[PDB]
Subunit: 246 residues, 4 copies
């Protein structure tokens, strides 16, 4: 059939942007998918279901451990065990450090690190029992280098890469792998608001002078979830048009 | 006597009544800096530790503040400003550890490690930067770990927090790059702390020295400990004029851990 | 799902081990492939047959990659036989284990020349056509030893680090084009070379016991306590050559069982 | 006598100008005896020796083609004869050539690899036995930001400097249980005659001869501090790595780059 046929994937933060694109590519590769995050919502789900797999949606606030638990238990009831966990936070706040609001710092750290930790903690026992798993953490180039005015985001994304390494090491002798994807600039509403002058925005950071697409990030997730990635453990797949190469 | 390289600079070291932080405070004072020490709560030992650091002829204070409470961080900075003057060197060091597999890692310990090892550094840096910018000079020295560059089993929260602290260091350095303020991180490997010394003595009596060798062999190719004095020496180097253009980087003091 | 149908690939050092696994996976994905080795072999045919089992056009060409004129001959042979080179896999596959003090000068030079300068020459020779056509993939087979050091592998670590540096520059010089350049960084792969290393360890330390020696050899560096396979390296190559990788540029795909994560 | 490197004997390759001269001067300031080195004898040699000798230590100068292993060995033997055992070896080799990969001349590629990488291997190989016998040593390899990241039109140099960092790690690991350390320093753009030459070439080709404009563009592209690193700062990093506080710094990079690799 298809490379991920039968596999059950959960994508946190899959309502729009990168998370939705990852969900689409996973379903396109054959995975059943749970979208976390209402007529428009039904339209979005139908679009994911166009790839012929079982699609579900859930509305867990990823900052509340009880609701993350409910997301996992919902998936187990509906589709069976969570085999592919994609930790995708999807929030940003741009500010110099001196005026960076404390609550925005806390929110970015909470949703990138602590939420990924709680979801992973809840999913690992089943994956160990079943002898297989994929934890795919959606980091950023900002998890490998710094950028001005993105202190909380760079700290959170660096942290998520560190977490990734530890989870991979603790599972290295199993059928479970944990890795991170590090996208450069992807065309999203936030990036559109910051910005013709697309070229100046890209030229500063992204030598390809073009955007990464949500499809390309999804393709990286599919690769990490494939059998050819069985021995890819604790690493980054950077999809960034050359950002980190310079 | 003669002026030393950091003479006249006021430094604040968090978590500096013992271990690595105390070693850093000692070396900064030896290099001529005034120093404010810090811990979570007042202890009977504060006077003796203050006088140990003050043996090198600089002004030394101690201020107890829970670094997880932004208001107490602010109080530490304001206390330093009132007692000694503007904070010119900030060393973010207070940190805790908890070893556990990810599946059973307690939620409260995860939160504490993130709060102290990463978010407290953010608060203190935010509070010190405006004065540094006004004066045109500063040093922010973040005490990370090898665990901020690589992973280790059963240290998920610590590796996440220390990686995050390195990311933060990069951003602060970039936002200040055209000024006389630098921000950098030091990344120690296994350091011979009093706690580590106790553990080694206990293991060497019970099962044996060779205890040291077994503990270090996995991770630290030198098969020897880093000392708190060496970490302090790295802080003095970053604080010195020769490091005016070292920005956003790591000084790894780890006996070869990250090299392999 | 033959994502490389229509594309012509050249894999250097591809009659054994990792190069052969990469060539096999490229052909399976639909690429026409040119195999290469230093000197021709009577068994070449059999090896070629295996690759051609996947139904693409397969050729073989013997070129000493340390001789620029022979690298040029390989590229011109491919252009005449199959068409323009679209996927270049630079794969050297040589090793010498020794402490620095006694490391032979000739072995140092040979490791630098084949790992690094040969990839430079082949890339030089392939880029004009790929710029003219507007598409290309240059895939450099580095190592974990291009990201970290290991004892007694000074030349190999230097060469593999240098190959990663070269990868970044090529990627930056082509970033606005349809040409990408990236590196794959394998850990320990079970290949005859690594088996020789293990045999040396077994004789020196374990009474010749290859099972004990293999476990000690893997546990030193590779947390998975298992080998990476040549098929896995080839899968990474197919991923880099695919359209999902159009914006993967100047980076490393590390396939190492956790080696660099710790 | 009270300076941190007093009595240590240091060899700095490529040290009659630029970064290497700055390193030699700072080592001497720190109390080290220093051997200077360049490709061929120059009428300016005595004035440079005087510059380094201003700090009251012993200084020598030896001309040696660092691509010739026999001349590297002669440099080491000369030092042993004149000053004593080589205790600090600074492998410094700034040779650069800027070209796109497609037109990069093969002989320039070969030269950059030979000098920026293979010469360091030979010199290290020749110095390690004495350092092992004495139980102390420093091997300080002058890499670059270009050993950690790439830059356009610097394929050979980026490859050579990345290789030198890899070499550094291996040497440090093979000596990790001894008093010998090996580390690399990674400068960004440093204010030196060679870098000014590179900026001038760009100024003529793209900025109408305007050195100010070319310098601003050069720095803005890569170096967030928008200022040069100085040879004195690179030398200060060498003194730090050579000092007792660096006894457990092994196989790492000290990056002095105004923020280049941080972004």
């Amino acid at each position: 059939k298809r490379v991920l046929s039968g596999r059950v994937a959960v994508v946190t933060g899959s309502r729009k942007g990168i998370g939705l694109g990852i969900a689409m590519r996973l379903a396109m590769a054959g995975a059943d998918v749970v979208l976390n995050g209402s007529p428009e919502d039904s339209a979005i789900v139908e679009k994911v279901a166009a790839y012929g797999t079982r699609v579900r949606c859930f509305a867990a606030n990823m900052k509340d451990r009880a609701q993350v638990e409910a997301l996992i238990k919902f998936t187990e009831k509906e589709l069976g065990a969570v085999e592919i966990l994609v930790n995708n936070a999807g929030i940003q706040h741009v500010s110099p450090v001196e005026t960076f609001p404390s609550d925005k710092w806390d929110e970015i750290i909470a949703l990138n690190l602590t939420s990924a930790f709680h979801a992973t903690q809840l999913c690992l026992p089943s994956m160990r029992q079943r002898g297989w798993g994929r934890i795919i953490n959606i980091a950023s180039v900002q998890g490998l280098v710094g950028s001005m005015n993105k202190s909380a985001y760079c700290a959170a994304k660096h942290g998520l890469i560190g977490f990734t390494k530890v989870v991979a090491l603790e599972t290295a002798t199993t059928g479970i792998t944990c890795n991170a994807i590090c996208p450069g600039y992807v065309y999203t509403p936030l990036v559109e608001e910051q910005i013709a002058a697309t070229q100046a925005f890209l030229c500063e950071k992204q030598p390809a002078k073009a955007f990464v697409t949500v499809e390309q990030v999804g393709d990286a997730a599919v690769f990490l979830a494939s059998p050819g990635a069985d021995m890819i453990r604790g690493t980054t797949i950077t999809v960034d048009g050359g950002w980190v190469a310079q």
